[PDB]
Structure formats: structure tokens, C-alpha cells
Amino acid sequence: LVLVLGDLHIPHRCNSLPAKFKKLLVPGKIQHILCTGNLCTKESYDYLKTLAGDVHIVRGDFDENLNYPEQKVVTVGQFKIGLIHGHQVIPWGDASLALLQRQFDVDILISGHTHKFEAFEHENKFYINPGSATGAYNALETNIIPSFVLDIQASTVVTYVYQLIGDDVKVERIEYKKS
Amino acid sequence: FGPICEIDVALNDGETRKMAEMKTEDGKVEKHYLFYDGESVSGKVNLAFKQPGKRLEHQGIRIEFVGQIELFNDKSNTHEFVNLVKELALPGELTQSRSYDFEFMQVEKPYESYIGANVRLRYFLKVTIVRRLTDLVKEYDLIVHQLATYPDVNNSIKMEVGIEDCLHIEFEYNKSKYHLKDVIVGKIYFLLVRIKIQHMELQLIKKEITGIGPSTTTETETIAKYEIMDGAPVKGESIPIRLFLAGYDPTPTMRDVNKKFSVRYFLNLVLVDEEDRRYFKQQEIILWRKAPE
Amino acid sequence: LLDEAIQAVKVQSFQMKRCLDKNKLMDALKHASNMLGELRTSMLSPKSYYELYMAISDELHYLEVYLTDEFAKGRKVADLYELVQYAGNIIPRLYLLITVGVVYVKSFPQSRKDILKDLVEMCRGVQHPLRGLFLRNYLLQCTRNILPDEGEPTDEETTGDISDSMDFVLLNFAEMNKLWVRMQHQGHSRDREKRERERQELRILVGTNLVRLSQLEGVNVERYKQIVLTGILEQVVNCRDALAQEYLMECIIQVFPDEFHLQTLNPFLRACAELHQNVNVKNIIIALIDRLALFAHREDGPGIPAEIKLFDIFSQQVATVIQSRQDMPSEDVVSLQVSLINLAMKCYPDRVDYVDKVLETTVEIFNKLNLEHIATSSAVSKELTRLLKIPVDTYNNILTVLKLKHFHPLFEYFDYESRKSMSCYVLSNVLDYNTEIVSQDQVDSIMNLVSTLIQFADEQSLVGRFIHLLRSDDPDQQYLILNTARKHFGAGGNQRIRFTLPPLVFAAYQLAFRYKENSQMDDKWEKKCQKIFSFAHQTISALIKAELAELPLRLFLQGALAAGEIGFENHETVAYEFMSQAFSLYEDEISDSKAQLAAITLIIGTFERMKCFSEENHEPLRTQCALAASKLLKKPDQGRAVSTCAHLFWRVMECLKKALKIANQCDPSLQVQLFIEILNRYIYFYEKTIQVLNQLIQKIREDLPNLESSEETEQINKHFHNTLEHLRSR
């Protein structure tokens, strides 16, 4: 199981996590945690430190901890996974992010920086933009919904996206395997 | 062969009598027929015949009632204060066993048969078979007690004795003329203390007094050793006393019993400190026999 | 001399029991009096006599049950009262006179009231400290249930009642208390600490007796008061020993039940006022109102009668207790305030003015307490640390902590590390229980609570929590919050405000994003924003004054975003003005090229999303970011800049040409990948200049292979190819 998130903005744009998410982010279950950045405090990362240990995060623009890398590329299982925070995408909105994927020889990308959840596949390579697990506010997007995403077995990663809609947690799930 | 005759004295009232007993030397106790003042002494003196054939030359048989006192273990100092005599047989000869009844008049018995330290007061029936050379004497002792009653006055003894600037107490005895089954009740009232008393008590000394004039013998005897306040108290404390006399069985006072001796009963408060200094005070009580009413 | 006294008891009780089996009671009475002659010793320790106490108290218990069955079925040996009163040794006598006496109470209840009265008068026959007590304690055991009572069956031949019970055992008790004081004054002056440790050993000997007083149930609330209360109170005032009252004054309220204490606090607190000065008063009075809380807490019972309002008296009388106290450390005084606060919370959780007054009185306690500024190292701190925690945790609403009137006047004496951390504990707690919309009743005090906190990463944490705590749904007071937070947050200095001002800007952002909804409601909506934006800009200018470079760029950007997203009038020149302002800080202040990239790239991301600017100031900054592109030092970013400047022409070929020349202006592997980007720049605008694709596509194929094969070209050799497979748009 691999936790995917990004753009916490603690204490920048929000401070209060869903307790609905806090109970669904109990430690022990997930193996790996992959945030895009913009955590904006060590303790926003140190909350994620309680959940698991195998964590890799890159730098966002509001990451005032300026020692996180620009990008990150990793291989575990049968997947070759790359990650970005998403601010170096010009413009935000597109195919053009696949051009970033072409630079790095990966099959799973993670982006962010637009604070909405989306995750998808093109040129037989995968791309993630999980949105904000805090439900951190977006500049252009006034209405904000919180969501964290969390499973590589062998050439197959199961993806549970835990969204906050209504008064419960609406978990969605699509399947993508290494083709 | 042994003796030829023995005098056996049986009373005519030798069944309805007891009057307790005691006592004698070497721990012995005398129990006999208990008489009182003004009572008659009526009985039978019987001669024991054991060897038939012999004839007994007698020149007189009598019985003397004796009320006597014994003092200083010498025969010549004995005094029989009451002696009534009944003659029993005329001068003659004897063949079989012979009994002799005897009944006198008013048998005045002025004092208690009381046996003290050097004084024995006793009553006995002295039968004297008079023969040519030696006479037969049979001593049948009789206990006599002295009855005084509950008096009109039995005063509260009380005295605030003690040692100057060391111990201030106030003793008290509720009666003075006690009887032999009375209870010894009193109270002690402390006023001041300076010395460190541990634990000490009350003494009962029976003072029988012997001797007349400049020759008077005084003996020391202590019956009981009671307690007291059992400590070193300060002001505001007292000592309650409950003492029974039945655990000692004393005799009556009878001061100057028949112009030769007395018997008296005293109380001593001795209090003992840690250095065991002895501090005493002497006070008499009076005893007299309470009769079973 | 402990052991052989117990053994010689067992030798003589052996001859006693064999005379108990042989119907020789009197020989066994001779055998017991030799055994009871041993018990007169003073050469033993108080433990040594107590272990020897129950030694014969089982041996005579064989003799006790010996006399009981004899009288039951008709073998009544008469006059046994004075039969055990013969010899001159009183422990042979009275211990036997106890056994006969409790039998003569049993066998003659017509002499019950008499012998209960008589033998305790005979129990005055010895005034020894040690041996009278173990006599008097063994008295209580043989006189446990034989005490007369209303709770006795109906047979018309008894003498005495509950009054004959209670007075005689108090007459036992009044002896036994001063006998404990007589323990304090026996022996030499070398064993007094040997005494007072062994005084605490035999203190429960008299502690047996008031337990026996407690088992009486026919005694009501008044019959305890005028006799049994005061008949215990008499020994309290007349013990004359400091170690006397300590075990006893607890053991009253410990053992005698709850309903006896209710009105009778007032003389018992006067009895606590009647205590010696040398005593440990502390463990008493906490245990004193221990039971009243337990009488308040318990269900299915009477509980606290509201007529005896404990609030109005414990505040006064236990104050008067300390008024009787002379030389005490002051931590004992507010350990009562530990209770005096806490008991008020449980008895009146509802009442406002009661709990309002005690702390106000406790401030007025400390108004008189001429003490130093309260540091950490003393014991008075941690208790006071406990005191103010009971509002902040144990209040029903933790807003009522903040609604407290005299709260902050107490807050003034603390140490620098404590006064911050308890407010941090306060600010954690008013967050950790999540409170809702806030108004001016508790807005300012919290800002004064942080005034105790400013005059760290935790401070970084809490302040970002704080406006997230002090966000409300009133529009303009919340703006004045953002004033008066920052005006207070300016008083902290500079080193913390470098972190905490941008959340106030983020507040001022979200304030404008709270101000953006009321278009249906109110028409002064546009006027506040630029005021707050300037107020943000001055907060930015404060951070400009706070010597920060990389952050207020984004705060200008997200400000220009927040300018650009609202659309209130005259924002655009400010939007552009600050964009320019930030761009000005970029071209001047920021020196590192990678951050300058990270500026100028995200500047274009701002400039693209400015889609907010009209072209008349865009094309100035479009040239000026192209000027800033030339301000860049390394090649590819500047190529990436002018590549993205073509998206700021969204020109077509104009931008492409410029980018091409720039990419041609230079490791050749690192060049040609950008030409693929240049292709994909063209491809992007192709998907909206047809042969410049086909010119450049073939142009990549000749400078593709002519290189050393390494670990990095091979992915790019693929990255060339699938790009052409992407070009298959069929």
C-alpha cells in the first residue's frame, strides 16, 4: 500500500485535517507515503511521520523547508515511479505533463499543485495529481475538497482515493497494472 | 498393759455446735465446740474400761470447766480466768465403765479463745481422776468467740499525711470498728509531689500486745501487702481502694483481753520510690466478730 | 525479654488447659495467675508487648470460653465477680475480671449497666501507659457486642442503653488517648524518636475503639453531636501532644460516617483550629473534604444537603483555619485552594459567580502574598500549574475559560518559560477541543493570552492555529482581529513574524475570500479588499522590512492572484503593481539563479494565470519577463522562459524562432532534448507552421546518434521516438 498526497499548507491555508481522515490515516496499514510538497511545516510532515516511514517528498513553492528535491524518481516492485510537486508545469492544465514523463523514463508520475484529485494513464505511463489531503485551499479554486490516496503487489498497483464528500468519506477506486 | 482408764467427754449438746475453727502452731487448726458468754456447759464424762479384773483405787473424780490464757511458755504464768467445777465420782472403787454427767449454771465466758503469737486463750474441760500417786488429766479443748456487735459510731478516719516538700497525700478510712467479714474502703487524695514513686502499697499488721509494765515484748508480723496509686502522679489524681478482709481471716480486737494481753489491727501506708526509701504512717482499725445473725 | 515471656505463658497455659480439662478451674486460675504475672513487664518495646498482647489473649480466650459453657447449661458456680478478685496482682485479676465481667454482663444484664460502669472505674486502678492500653484494648474486644443498645431484643431484665454504651467507651477512649500521650512521656529522653515511631505503631490500639463507636447505628445526627462528637472533641483539646491529633482527627471523619459531618464542619473546623501548631495539617484537610466530594459524587443516597452550603463556609472557616495557623510553608495554603477551586467546580458546575469569586479571592490571596515572581524551581509553581489547569481542562465549554473575568490578572506572576507554555497549553486546549465562531467577548483576551506568550516552531504552529482558531463569521471585527493580532504580533519582534505574518496574510486572503460572498448582501464589498491588500502589502512590507526574499514574492504573487481572482475595482494595477513590485524584488534582491528560475518560472505561471492582466501591461511585463529571461544566466531556463513566453503570446513563429535561436546559442545532449521540447512547443501550437515541424523533425535525426552512448541518452533516444509515435494522431 502506497499513500499518495500533496500540498498540505499547514498552517498556511488550512490547519484542521478531517478527523475522518485521521482515523482512516491510522498508522500501520500503508507501506509507503508519497507527498508532492507544500507541507509548509515540519510538523505537517511529522504528522505523516507518525503514519509510516518510507516517505519521499519533493519541494513545493510554499515549501519553506528548501531542502526537498526538485523531482524524485524511484523503483519498487515492478513499477518505475517518478514524482513532481507540479509548480514547474507551464501551464497547468495539460499531454504536456507526459513530456515531463518522457524525460525521466518512468511508468508512474505524481504531480500536484492544482489541489484537485486526478490520476490517469497516457502513453502507457501513469500520472497522479492527488490533491490536498488537508483540503488545503486553492488560489484559483475557491471550493476545496480534501482527499488522500492510497498498493503495488506485482506489476499491478491498487489505488484507493479517500475523498471527503457530504458527511462521510467517499472512497473511490480504479485499477491500473503495469502493462 | 498400757493405760487402765481413759476419760471421754461428750457434751449433752455436742451436735448443734460448730463456731468455725483455727488455729495452732506448725500450721495446725483447732476445731471444737463453739461457746459464747452466758451459755451453760452440759455434758457427759465417760471412763473407758479396757482390762477386766483389775480394781481401780480412786479418791475423787471431778471435772473443772476451765477458761484460761497461756503466755510465755511457762507453767507458772498460766491463769484460768473462769473455772467452774463439777464433781463426778466419790472416793471409791471401780469395776466396769462409768459415765459422769455434768451440768453447771451460768457459764460466764468473758472473752474469745484466741491464739496469737505468744498468747493462747483456750477453754477446755479438765477432768481429774485423783489416784494415790498420779492423776488422770484429759484435755478436751473448746473454742469460745467474743461477740461484739455493729457499734453506734464507726467513724471516718482521715488524715493528710506525707513527707514535707516531697509528697502530699490525704488518706481516709470510712470505718474504724470493722468486723472480720467487712470490706476495707478508703480514698487517697494527692496534693503535691516531688519524689519519683514507683509502686507501693498498704500493710496489715496484727498487733497482739504481750507483757505488763516495763517488761513488754513487741513482735513484728505483716499479713498483707496491698498496692496504691501505682506510679508517680501529679495533682488532680486519686486512688480508689477495694480490699476484702475475708482473704486473711483475722480475729477481733478485744483490747486488753483479761488484764494480761491485747490484740490490735493496724494499717500502714508505705510508698516506695526508685531508691526504695520507706515512708510510713500508722493507723489502727478495730475488729470484732460479726455473728451469723 | 520478649520471647521467654511468651513461652512461659505457654508453659503455664499448658498446665491451665490440662486443669481446664480436669475441671480444675481454680488450679488453672492458679496456673493462669502465674502466666498473667509475666505481663507486667516494662522492659519491652511497644511492638514486643503488642505481639505478647494477643499471646495470652488467645490463652485466656481458652479460659474465656471455659467459663461460658459452664454457666449456660446449669453448672453455675455463683459469685464469680469477686472470685477473680482475690490476689494482689491485678493483671491476673482484671483480665480475669474482664472475662467474668463480660460474662456477668451476659449472665446478669441486671448488672449490665453496673459492671460496664464499675469495671472501667476499676480499670482506673492502674495508670501505666503501656499495660493499661492493652488492657483497655482487650476490654473493647470482650465488650464489643455486649454494649447496650436500642438495637437489642425485647426481654425485660436488662440494665442500660446506647448511652451507657457510648459514654463508657468514651470513658475508655478518654483514658486511652492520654495514655497515647502517656506513651509520649515514658522512658528516657534518648528514645523519643524510638517512642514516636512506636507511638505510630500502637496508635491504632485506641483506633480500635472509635470503630466500635462507629458500629452503633441507633445514634442519630443529634445523639452523636452533643455527646459522641464532643466526647471525642474533649480528647482533641486535652491531648497536649502534636503527634496525638494527627492519627485521631482524621480517624473521626475517616471512620464515623458521612451524615455526621454535614452541619458539624463548623466545630470540627474549629476543632481543626483547636489543633496543635506543630502538626501536619496538610494531609488532614484534603482528606476532610475528600468524603464530601464522595458524598456529592455518590448515587442512590442522600448527597449534599443544600442548606449547609459548603461553599459559603469552607471558604471562610478553612481560611480561619490558616488564620489559626502560624508558621507554615505557603504551598500548604493553596493546597487548600486546590480543594477550594475544585470543590466549587463539582458542587456548582452550573453557577457562574461562585467559581468566579474563588479564583478572584485566590488572586486576592496573592494580592496579600508578598512573594517573588513565580519561577519554575519552587514547589509553589507546580501546584499553581495545577490550579489554572482546572479551568482550561475541566470547564464545560472551554470558551468559559476565556469568558472568565479575572483570569488574566492571575496570569501575571509566572516565569518566562511557564507563562508561554501554559498559554501554549491553553492555546492547544482551546484548539484540541475545537471551538466555533468567536466574538469580541473572548477575542481580545486570547490576544492578551498571547501577550503573555510573546513578551519557535511551536509559535509557528500555534499562531497559524490561532487565526484558524480566531476565524469568525463577522466580517469587519475579524479584520480588526487581523489588525490587532498583527499589532500584537508586531510586538513580538521580527524573528517569529517571518513565519506568522503570511498566515495573517492567508487570513487576509481568506478574509477577502470571506468578503467575496456578500455581493447579494452589501455593496461596500470592493472597498475593504485593497485596504486589506495594502494591509497585506504593509504586512508584506513588514516582511520586506523583516529581510525576507523568497516568501514575499509568492505573497505578492498569491496576493496578485487574490487580487486577480476577486475582481474588485482598481486591483489590477495593484495586481500588476505588486507583480511588478515582486518582479522588482526578483530583478534586484534575489541572486541565486535556481530560485530566480523558481521566481521567474512561477512568475510566468502567475503571468499566465493573470490571464488576469490586459495586454497593455502584460506586453510590458511580457517584454520585461523576456527582459528577465535575458536577466537569466544559464541557457536552458532562458530557453524554457522564451518557450513559455510563447504561451504568453497566448507568438506562433515569432516566439518559436526566438526560442530556437536561444537553444542554438549552445553538452550537446542537453541541447537537443530542448529541441524536442521546441518540437513539442511547436506540436502544442500545431495542435491548436506546418513544415517547420517537418523541417525540425528531420533536423533532430542527424544530431541524434552522433554521440557516446551512456546511461542517459538511451531514455532520451526513446523519448525522441515515442514523441514521433505521439505524432501519429491518426
C-alpha cell at C439: 466574538
Confirm whether B199 is domain-assigned. Answer: yes
Q: Are residues B131 and B169 in the same domain?
A: no
Judged by a CB distance cut-off of 8 A, whether residue C85 touches chain B is yes
Antiparallel, parallel or unpaired: β B177-179 and B224-225: unpaired
Task: Quote the radius of gyration of chain B (alpha carbons, Å).
Answer: 26
Residue C539: count other Cβ atoms within 10 Å of its Cβ.
27
For chain C, positions 551-580, list CB contacts with chain A under 8 A: 551, 554, 558, 561-562, 565
C-alpha separations of C16 from B126, C71, C91, C675 in Å: 51, 19, 16, 122
Residues from A contacting C (CB-CB < 8 Å) are 10-16, 41-43, 61-62, 64, 66, 87-92, 94-96, 99, 102-105, 123, 137, 139-140, 142
Count up the domains in chain B and report the number.
Answer: 2
How far CA C587 is from CA of C238, C400, C599, C621, in Å, comes to 93, 52, 10, 12
Q: Are C510 and C471 in contact (CB under 8 A)?
A: yes
Interchain contact C721–A (C-beta under 8 A): no
Question: What resolution in angstrom units was achieved for this structure?
Answer: 5.7
Residue B88 lies in a domain: yes
Q: Taking the CA atoms of C708, C714, C716 and C718 in sequence, report the sign of the dihedral they define.
A: positive
End-to-end CA distance of chain C: 117
DSSP, collapsed to helix, strand or coil, labels residue C533 as helix
Listed by number, the residues of chain C in 472-531 with a beta carbon closer than 8 Å to a beta carbon of chain A are 499, 502-503, 506, 509-510, 513, 516
Kindly state whether residues B126 and B219 are assigned to the same domain.
Answer: no
Q: How many helices (H) and strands (E) does chain C have?
A: 37, 0
Q: Are residues B283 and B167 in the same domain?
A: yes
User: How many beta carbons lie within 10 A of that of residue A166, not counting itself?
Assistant: 7
Chain A closest-CA separation from residue C462 CA (Å)? 9
Q: Does C26 touch chain B (CB under 8 A)?
A: no
Determine the Cα–Cα distance for residues C584 and C672; give it in Å rounded to an integer: 33
Does residue B117 sit in the same domain as residue B24? yes
- Cβ burial of C296 (10 Å; 0-12, 13-18, 19+) is middle
d(Cα C628, Cα C601) in Å, to the nearest integer? 10
Give the single-character DSSP code of C123: G
| Cα separation, B93 vs B98, whole angstroms | 11
Number of residues in chain A? 179
Asked if residues B190 and B235 have their Cβ atoms less than 8 Å apart, the reply is yes
Q: Which range of residues forms the domain containing residue B37?
A: 5-142
Q: Is the dihedral of CA C641, C644, C649, C651 positive or negative?
A: positive
In angstroms, the CA B13 to CA B213 distance is 42
For residue B150, being part of any structural domain is answered with no
Scan residues 115-144 of C and list those with Cβ closer than 8 Å to B: 121-122, 124-128
Of residues C161, C69, C166, C150, the one with CA closest to residue C112 = C161
Select from A87, A102, A103 the Cβ nearest to the Cβ of C602.
A87
Do B125 and B167 lie in a common domain? no
Which of B225, B240, B244 has its CB closest to that of C125? B240
- The alpha carbon of residue B204 is apart from the nearest alpha carbon of chain C, in Å, by 13
Instruction: Please enumerate in sequence order all residues whose Cβ is within 8 A of that of C173, keeping only pairs 6 or more positions apart, or say none.
Output: C206, C209, C210, C213, C231, C232, C235
> Residue B20 contacts by C-beta under 8 Å, 6 or more apart in sequence?
B31, B34, B143, B145
Query: Contact at 8 Å (CB) between C469 and C519?
Result: no
- A104 alpha carbon, distance to own chain's centre: 18
Distance of CA C107 to the CA centre of its chain: 61
Residue where a domain stops, chosen among B100, B119, B142? B142
Lay out the sheet containing B5-11: strands in order across.
B5-11, B42-49, B99-103
The answer to whether the CB of C383 falls within 8 A of the CB of C365 is no
State the DSSP H helix or E strand holding residue B58, giving kind and residue range, or none if neither. none
Q: Which domains does chain A have, with CATH numbers?
A: 2-177 (3.60.21.10)
Q: Is B149 a domain residue? A: no
- Residue B129: partners with Cβ closer than 8 Å, 6 or more residues away: B5, B7, B47, B58, B60, B61, B89, B135, B136
The CATH number assigned to the domain holding B33 equals: 2.60.40.640
The Cβ of residue C237 has, within 10 Å, a number of other Cβ atoms equal to 12
Instruction: Report how far residue C38's alpha carbon sits from residue C2's, in angstroms, rounded to the nearest whole number.
Output: 10
B268 falls within a domain: yes
Q: How far apart are CA C30 and CA C654, in angstroms?
A: 136
Do B281 and B183 lie in one domain? The reply is: yes
Instruction: Kindly provide the residue ranges of all beta strands, DSSP E only, lying in C149-270, ordered along the sequence.
Output: none
Angle between helices C457-469 and C497-515 (to 10 degrees): 20
Set of cell numbers at residue A142: 475557491
Question: End of a domain among B104, B119, B142?
Answer: B142
- Residue B274 included in any domain: yes
Cell triple for A143: 471550493
Residues B38 and B92 in one domain: yes
Domain membership flag for residue B147: no
Q: Closest Cα to residue C458, out of A15, A39, A43?
A: A43
User: Residue A63 in contact with residue A90, Cβ under 8 Å?
Assistant: no
B118 and B189 together in one domain: no
Strand order in the sheet with B162-163: B162-163, B167-168, B192-193
CB contact under 8 A, C554 and A62: yes
CB C480 within 8 A of CB C532: no
β A54-57/A32-35 pair status: parallel
Nearest to A83 by CA among A114, A115, A110: A110
Give me Rg for the CA atoms of chain A: 15
Task: Determine the Cα–Cα distance for residues A160 and A164; give it in Å rounded to an integer.
Answer: 13
Contact at 8 Å (CB) between B221 and B119?
Answer: no
Q: Which of C108, C23, C9 is nearest to C54 (CA)?
A: C9
Q: First CA to last CA across chain A, in angstroms?
A: 19
Q: How far apart (Å, rounded) are the C-alpha atoms in residues C700 and A84?
A: 28
A96 with C608: Cβ contact below 8 A:
no
Does C427 contact A at CB distance below 8 Å?
no
Touching C (3+ Cβ pairs <8 A), the chains are A, B
Give the max Cα distance, chain C.
Answer: 143
Scan for cell 509566572, then name that residue: C414
Q: Which three cell numbers stand for residue C161?
A: 442503653
DSSP result, C290-333: HHHHHHHH-SSS----TTS-HHHHHHHHHHHHHHH--S--THHH
- Answer whether residue B152 is part of any domain: no
Q: Could you give the CA distance from residue A88 to residue A60 in angstroms, rounded to a whole number?
A: 9
In the structure grid, which three cell numbers stand for residue C10, read together? 505457654
CA gap C634, C88 in Å, rounded: 122
C127 closest CB neighbour out of B224, B226, B231: B231
Among B142, B168, B191, identify where a domain stops.
B142
Whether residues C468 and A105 touch (CB distance < 8 A) is answered with no
Residue B236 DSSP class: T
Helix (H) or strand (E) holding C354: helix C352-368
8 Å CB contact of C561 and A14: no
Q: Are the Cβ atoms of A123 and C598 closer than 8 angstroms?
A: no
Q: Letter for the amino acid at B165? A: D
Method: cryo-EM
The rounded distance, in Å, linking the Cα atoms of A84 and A80 is: 14
Query: Cβ separation of A43 and C677 shorter than 8 Å?
Result: no
Query: Which residue is it, cell 498569491?
Result: C558
β-pairing, B119-129 vs B136-142, is antiparallel
Angle value at C-alpha C533, between C530 and C535, nearest 5 degrees = 115
Phi, psi of B173 (to 5 degrees): -130, 130
| Per-residue burial over B40-62, b = 16 or more CB atoms within 10 Å of its CB, e = otherwise | ebebbbbbebeeeeeebebeebb
Of all residues in chain C, what percent are helix, strand and coil, respectively (each to 5)?
70, 0, 30
Q: Are C641 and C601 in contact (CB under 8 A)?
A: yes
Distance, CA of C627 to CA of C603 (rounded, Å): 13
Cβ <8 Å between A137 and C551: no
Secondary element (H or E) of residue B128: strand B119-129
Are B53 and B90 found together in one domain? yes
Three-class SS of residue B281?
coil
Three-state SS at C478 = helix
**Residue B219 and residue B127 share a domain:** no
DSSP run (H or E) holding C152: none
Residues whose CB is less than 8 angstroms from the CB of residue A70 and which lie 6 or more positions away in sequence, other chains included: A58, A59, A84, A88
B62 and B100 co-located in one domain? yes
Q: In whole angstroms, what separates CA C181 from the centre of its chain?
A: 42
Return the ∠ at Cα C82 (arms to C136 and C153), rounded to 5°: 65
C-alpha cell of residue A54: 518510507
